[PDB]
Write an enzyme that holds these catalytic residues in place. Structure first.
Site, mmCIF file in Angstrom:
data_model
loop_
_atom_site.group_PDB
_atom_site.id
_atom_site.type_symbol
_atom_site.label_atom_id
_atom_site.label_comp_id
_atom_site.label_asym_id
_atom_site.label_seq_id
_atom_site.Cartn_x
_atom_site.Cartn_y
_atom_site.Cartn_z
ATOM 1 N N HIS B 4 5.493 43.882 -49.547
ATOM 2 C CA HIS B 4 5.431 43.777 -50.997
ATOM 3 C C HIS B 4 5.103 42.317 -51.297
ATOM 4 C CE1 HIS B 4 6.565 44.644 -55.201
ATOM 5 N NE2 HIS B 4 7.352 43.581 -55.169
ATOM 6 N N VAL B 30 17.943 39.662 -50.638
ATOM 7 C CA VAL B 30 17.996 40.377 -49.370
ATOM 8 C C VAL B 30 19.450 40.715 -49.023
ATOM 9 C CG1 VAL B 30 17.618 40.200 -46.888
ATOM 10 C CG2 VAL B 30 15.855 39.437 -48.498
ATOM 11 N N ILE B 33 20.490 43.728 -51.930
ATOM 12 C CA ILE B 33 19.759 44.980 -52.028
ATOM 13 C C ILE B 33 19.457 45.508 -50.628
ATOM 14 C CG2 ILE B 33 17.686 46.098 -52.976
ATOM 15 C CD1 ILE B 33 17.522 43.859 -55.027
ATOM 16 N N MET B 36 15.799 45.835 -49.193
ATOM 17 C CA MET B 36 15.094 44.577 -49.034
ATOM 18 C C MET B 36 15.459 43.968 -47.701
ATOM 19 S SD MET B 36 15.192 41.899 -52.089
ATOM 20 C CE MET B 36 13.946 40.669 -52.395
ATOM 21 N N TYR B 71 14.768 49.442 -54.519
ATOM 22 C CA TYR B 71 14.735 48.052 -54.960
ATOM 23 C C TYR B 71 14.385 47.962 -56.445
ATOM 24 C CZ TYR B 71 12.243 43.656 -55.898
ATOM 25 O OH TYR B 71 11.765 42.502 -56.482
ATOM 26 N N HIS B 74 17.247 48.767 -58.625
ATOM 27 C CA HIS B 74 18.504 48.101 -58.308
ATOM 28 C C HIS B 74 18.845 47.086 -59.387
ATOM 29 C CE1 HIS B 74 21.670 45.936 -56.259
ATOM 30 N NE2 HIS B 74 21.641 46.825 -55.282
#
Lengths: 100, 100
Positions: B4, B30, B33, B36, B71, B74
């Site tokens: 991404h 990171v 989530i 991630m 994600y 979230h």
């Protein structure tokens, strides 16, 4: 290590087979140019930014800032541009040291 | 695993300290989530494409196409956008499966 990021859009007339050959040939430059350490490419799937229309990403790793020029003047990189210049409509080029 | 990629330009009024905080806070997602998996960012050094003027790159790894949505919804990602929306002038977003 530094990253060299190419973001591009192909011309409308370029076929899928031609794109596959383009990337296969570019990826192989890692085997020819010492400074070029690795490469991956990808086709964007999201198409969020349709007006801009960039479709593909290439990310190259170089061992250093100073060795990028070795790639830039290498006959194999110059040759790749000479063969495939007419394939792309536009591009963006970035160079950076990854951080976290 | 999928990538991404965020390509962005900050607004002119945003300071270097604010940019540092922006990226520090994004990188920490990171830890919050699950989907991630990793993140790196970088500042472009070449400035080849001055009219477009994108300056920074963020690359995030997700375990799959299907977990990106985890994600996206979230609260921590939504929250990041809510806090820092006013910092960026423009961006491009790409999602792709790396190939070689």
């Amino acid at each position: 290590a530094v990253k060299h990021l190419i973001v591009l859009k192909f011309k409308d007339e370029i076929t899928e087979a031609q794109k596959e050959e383009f990337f296969k040939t570019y990826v192989n430059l890692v085997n020819i140019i010492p400074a070029m350490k690795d490469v991956y490419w990808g086709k964007d799937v999201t198409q969020k930014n349709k007006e801009e229309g960039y479709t593909h990403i290439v990310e190259v790793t170089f061992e250093s800032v100073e060795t990028i020029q070795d790639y830039i003047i290498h006959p194999a990189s110059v040759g790749f541009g000479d063969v495939y210049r007419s394939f792309w409509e536009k591009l963006l080029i970035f160079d950076y040291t990854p951080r976290k």
